[PDB]
Amino acid sequence: NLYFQSMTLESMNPQVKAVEYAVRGPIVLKAGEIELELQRGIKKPFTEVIRANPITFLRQVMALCTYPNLLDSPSFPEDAKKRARRILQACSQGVNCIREDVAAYITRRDGGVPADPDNIYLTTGASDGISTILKILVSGGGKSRTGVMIPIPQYPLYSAVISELDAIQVNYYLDEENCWALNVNELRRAVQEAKDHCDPKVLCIINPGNPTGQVQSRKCIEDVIHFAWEEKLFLLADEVYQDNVYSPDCRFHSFKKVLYEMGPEYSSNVELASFHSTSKGYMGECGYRGGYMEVINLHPEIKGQLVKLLSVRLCPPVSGQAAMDIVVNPPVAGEESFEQFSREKESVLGNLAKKAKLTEDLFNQVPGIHCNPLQGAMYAFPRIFIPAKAVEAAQAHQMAPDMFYCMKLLEETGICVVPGSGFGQREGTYHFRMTILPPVEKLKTVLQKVKDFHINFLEKY
């Protein structure tokens, strides 16, 4: 299923190799076949295959760090320069003053709930943090082997890491009939069923969600923390999309803030690792890959393994670290760039909110498609109601129903989306992942195509 695509020798001292593996399923192969058809002049109903997958201050600080001579330029505000200088001067858990900046950023975001720089670890993406935390937590054998609880629909990193570590995957189903909510009665069933054949010890929460685009309510975060406390579960709070919250009905509440607000009975006891990245959201930068995790209440046995693991790895590249520093040091009240930064953010978030409402509106006025509200992150996961007969057609082709549907959509419109079966879903349900990344007029055009295709599809099978 997985095939070797590339290798990179990252270093010899210490020696690290990075291997890329590609899954080359039916859609990937067909998209390639179609791209070559278009290249040798085959006339198609579309002219291209479409996949789909800004803040001045950040560009400015980045430009200053790339070319420090611009610290004497007047093309640049002084609050930018102040960031560049601190980063240039600073360049084991990560650079000290960057960890301080993250801590201070957490504190501001959480309305004054304190964060300690010594609980911060800089990583090469949230992926690296999640891998590292899961690796130090998995142990035991047979019926005592660590169970890791993960949502369905999945962000497929977690399944993959669980396999590499030979841990046991414990599925919990996000609640599609209540905006993809985490449902504790459901988590309780999943934990109770898994205890026969593993030791459930870890619970991974993705908020805002991917590919489901939901934002959890405070009460629900609170009920999950209580459940984790009760069952002695280590929580991983994957919060990489925390700045991309759109709905006026929703806000981002960190697991950190809620844990602390529940009081010391919880906040002294519950183990929590919260992740953040430089790659996601409207503050997202590319090229320079950074991240952090904030870890609280780490059991000493676990911390020992972390200290060792970090003694034998190289620090994350400092440019990733610098990138993270920029994202956790935006301008604050009374600084030169605060007002324009504030206007740029609001405009970007208003445009996403607009695309979100637009997408969900269109799907919900098309029969046989239903879309939960898109509250944050960049993806929707619409449910497709595939007739028992289009299901039969799909079966005849040896394909999952939504794979077949997504293949046909590609073949007719050139629109290339990922089927729900790439993420997992409740048995008997079918979805696909949609992005709101495209600009509004293009997004409108994609949604028209998806609508026409969808109506015809139902007519046909």
Ligand SMILES: *Cc1c(COP(=O)(O)O)cnc(C)c1O
């Ligand atoms: C992309 C992503 C990650 C990994 O983040 P990087 O910083 O790119 O490693 C983790 N969790 C979710 C939900 C993601 O979308």
